Amino acid sequence: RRRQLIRQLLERDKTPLAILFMAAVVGTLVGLAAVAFDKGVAWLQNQRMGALVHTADNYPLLLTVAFLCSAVLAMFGYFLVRKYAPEAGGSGIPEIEGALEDQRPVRWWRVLPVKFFGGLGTLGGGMVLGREGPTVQIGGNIGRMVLDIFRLKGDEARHTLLATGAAAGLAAAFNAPLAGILFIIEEMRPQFRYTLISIKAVFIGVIMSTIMYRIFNHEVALIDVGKLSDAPLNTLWLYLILGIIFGIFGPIFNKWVLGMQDLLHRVHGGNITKWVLMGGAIGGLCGLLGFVAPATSGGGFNLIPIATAGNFSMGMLVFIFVARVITTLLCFSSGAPGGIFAPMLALGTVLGTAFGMVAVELFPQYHLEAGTFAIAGMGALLAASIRAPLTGIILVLEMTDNYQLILPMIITGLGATLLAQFTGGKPLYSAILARTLAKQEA
């Protein structure tokens, strides 16, 4: 080897310039697109807001116009995915992970329009699904598109430009450049074999996309809480006990998202009419929940700062979690385009706040603030159920700027990704791809 190694070292990090110049173009396009998705999504929540105005009087009429406004946009997405692109229902991240393995189809002429308008229906109608499912999928399909357009060849260029597009696409959904690269590295790469994915190109990819978001999204942050208090050393052990609670609930939730995918399927049984109809009752329910309990529906970002600043009661927290646990499943197990990544951030924030409130009344001598346990628990479901703690931690840190909590945050994240291992949980994005390859040869 040594001679090989001497030769391979002296020739390291030399990504083809064409791979680089073209990576800049992928993020430009994954950025403009990504921004476009989010502008659409609010604009319809707006209509739902502005339509609830014109009929704000017959209290039964209002309930249902919010039902039907989102019932209708709900169904439009279920269709545009069954009719023209089936691999674009749900998250789409399994699929892009699949494609890098060279095990799944990149149908960009079909998926880019299906996902883009599909998710607008479930995201703009008030559903429990993050912008992240569509944006990363669209981002890679975009990356495939310019590999086809300019007809560059090899495994390297196909894996680099597919990847950056998925990273520049997760950044632009959270203003999270680092947790963009760190998703490729920690979770989305072929996890059992080397790959020629150029990081230096997966980086240029996220610069351009991030810049596109800051040009349209600047001087407004998605979760703003400020600076919470510091965490003494003698209190760090509480952040382990939190991570253990996440470590055991991590899997149990994974059972429920997989299991319910199976049971919503029995409802329709693969019938595009039994199915779109079921999902406009889901979406009709979610535009109707987003008026009675804006906390039990929607992305969930709205309640996170309200959650962190200890503004809820213990009861309301108990309620909001059980409700969002439910409203999260129905939206993604139905396979409606859009992530579960974001509504888990919400789930986690809610959970930790409940945990802190206990701490505060048990230890006056620690002088605790429950919001630090929120920030610790916010990325905790992400660490414990899709098993990407390094990306989860760096994501929360990029969105809450509470770096003095970096230690209690890493300790809850390991405390989850460990206890999920010692009980019985799997990386959900490779348990999807597993079950989905388990029917591709069945």
């Epitope: 200890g310 001598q365 620690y366």
Partner: antibody, heavy 120, light 107 residues
Framework: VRLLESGGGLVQPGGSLKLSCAAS????????MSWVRQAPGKGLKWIGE????????NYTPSLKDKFIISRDNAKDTLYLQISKVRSEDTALYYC??????????????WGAGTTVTVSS | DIVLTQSPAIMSAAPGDKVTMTCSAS?????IHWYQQKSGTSPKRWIY???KLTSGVPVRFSGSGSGTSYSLTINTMEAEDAATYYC?????????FGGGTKLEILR
Amino acid sequence: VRLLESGGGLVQPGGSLKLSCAASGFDYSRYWMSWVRQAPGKGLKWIGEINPVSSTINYTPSLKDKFIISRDNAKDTLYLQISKVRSEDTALYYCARLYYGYGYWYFDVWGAGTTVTVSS
Amino acid sequence: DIVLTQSPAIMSAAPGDKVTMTCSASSSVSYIHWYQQKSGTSPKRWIYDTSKLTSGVPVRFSGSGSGTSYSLTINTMEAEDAATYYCQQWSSHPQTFGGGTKLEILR
């Protein structure tokens, strides 16, 4: 860095009075402040503490509203109001700034004190 | 509430001696603190976390113990060390102070 408490003069038994502590030299917010009193020639006795958002407030052996601690980070001031006073409260009142080492908290910087006499 | 109790309420020493005072508690306490209070002065955080010296405390001071028994020790006391010292804990809310060891001098 400094703590300067005031408002300690003379009170009738059973009455009430507002003490104030005015901090300078540090970010008065993001800082637990506290109150310790000292009867003449006796030893120190914790009164109360108050976190920065005024969200948590703990006290020592008291009654219904014996003590009442406040703050107004806008003016950078600590407050305290004894009421239904008796001769036990006629002592010296310190305003302390709280902080921790390993996490077991201490009274980091103490003010200079103001004196309450409860006489006729 | 945790009751802390001082070793010698009033001790007298001649500079160049070694002087130890001892703080004892009703229940287990851990990482306690010491305040020095010279005559007509607000208490000064003198020693904290059992054994850590506040910046500007001369090395002739040291702390030690473990909850039940804690001591402060002046190793070759000096005349400026004369004060009334206080131990305080906050391993159990509410925190609670000592009763004071008053160091007197012999000259």
